[PDB]
Every structure is written in C-alpha cells, then in structure tokens.
Amino acid sequence: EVPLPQLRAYTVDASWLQPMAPLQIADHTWQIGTEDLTALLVQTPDGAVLLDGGMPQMASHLLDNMKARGVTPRDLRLILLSHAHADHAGPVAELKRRTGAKVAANAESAVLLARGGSDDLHFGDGITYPPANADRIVMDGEVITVGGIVFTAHFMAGHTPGSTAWTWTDTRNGKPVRIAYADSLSAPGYQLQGNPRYPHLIEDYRRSFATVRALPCDVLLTPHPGASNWDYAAGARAGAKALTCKAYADAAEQKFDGQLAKETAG
Ligand SMILES: O=C(O)CNC(=O)[C@H](CS)NC(=O)OCc1ccccc1
Ligand SMILES: [Zn+2]
C-alpha cells in the first residue's frame, strides 16, 4: 500500500522571505518587500500604489512597511502586477481584504490571478495561491495616474501571457528619473518549442526582448532583483550595479537562445 503523495508547498530560498526596511529608490518610490523579492511602494499626495507584493505570507510585512512610510490601509489605492505568479502576486487577495486597494491588470494577468495561478501553462497546479479579482482591465500602452505619477503598461508576454513592464517618471535631486519595472524574461523549466498551450511562445519572447530594450529606462528594477543586478541588502550601493534595460534584454535573449539549443538537444 503506497498512498498518493502529499501536497507540496511552494518553498523558496530564505532570502526571498527575509524582511527588510523600506529602501528608497527615488523621491516617491520605495522597495518595501523582502531582500530577494521586489514590492514597490509609490507614495503621492493623492494616495499610494503597490507594484507586486511577493509571496502570500508577505502581506503583514508589506502593511508594516507601509505604516512606517505613513501609508495607512485606506491610503493604498492601487495594486499593479508584473505577472500573476505566486511569488509576485501571492498576497494580493489578502491585501485587497485589508486595505482600500483595487487591482488593475491586463486580461491575461486578471484571468490567471482569478485562478490563483492554477492551471499554469507550464507549472500546472504546482504554485497556486489565493485567487483575487481585478477591478480594472488595462490595454497595452494604457496609462493610469495616481497623484501625478503616470504609470504606463508595456505588454511583454512570454514568462506569462500577461507579463507587463510598468514605467513611470519620478525625481531624484529635482531631476527626472525614468523608472522601468520590467518583468521576468526567464523561462524556468518551460517547453519553448511546439508547446500546444503556447504556440507562439518563441515569437512573443523575441518581441518582449525588443520591448524591454526600448523602454524609457534611467533605472531598471525587476521582480527578482538579481535579474537586474540589484542587491537590496547592500544599502547605499543597493542599485549601484544595476543593469540597463538594454543589457537586461540582451542577457535574457542570450540565455533564451542557449535554452532553445539545450531543449533541441534534450
Ligand atoms: O526566478 C525565476 O525566474 C523563476 N522562479 C520561480 O520560483 C518561478 C516563479 S517566477 N516558479 C517556479 O519556478 O516554480 C516551479 C515549481 C515549483 C513547485 C511545483 C511545480 C513547479
Ligand atoms: Zn514567474
């Protein structure tokens, strides 16, 4: 008698779950997540925006960091997402219950979020999380403005169908800083070629490399900070080694081409 296996939790490196204090990126923009997962707070005179929340168990830590910044539950107006995997959208449902936040996302991200990341094109039910509903559906190139910070959506399908880069302009020394929060360009364990659930996967990734390369991009940030060479634990030099969007796109394409060759060989 051999029973069916137990459910397996989505377990991650400790650094992904290690709380950090708010780290200022620009005059209105702060990293408020963990050492190894990005969660960006943008604070304005007319309320706050959160871009990603990390893993499901980060909800209370995000709220504590918000409070440290002076942002109350009612002040949080909007949640935006890079993509709706458990390690970036994990706490969205809980945050919606505990704050005034509404979610804006593209149709692909909204559908995946509403499924709690189940029936993932590549991971199946391996990384599920509490489902949430989007309040507003955004189209490619659509802008959303909160307290004069203008967020533009740039669709960059591949890592997920609904993967998005969000760009906005903040300041640092009275000078503009064009921030690009670019989504993952990885395909971890994906079948790339002839995948029946994603027939045009390769062409979407190629288009997404080009989109990322061309973003307005004084400062690049990524959901996994290591992807853009950020080190959130390095304090005053956290962003010193950060890649350009151009360099991030180039490295991702080189890796992707390598993975294609390995897939053909395998
Ligand atoms: O850093 C990256 O690019 C990818 N890292 C991840 O953790 C991704 C989400 S972005 N998830 C994953 O690989 O999940 C694999 C998996 C885990 C449990 C069960 C099935 C599949
Ligand atoms: Zn992902």
Ligand SMILES: [Zn+2]
């Ligand atoms: Zn991830």
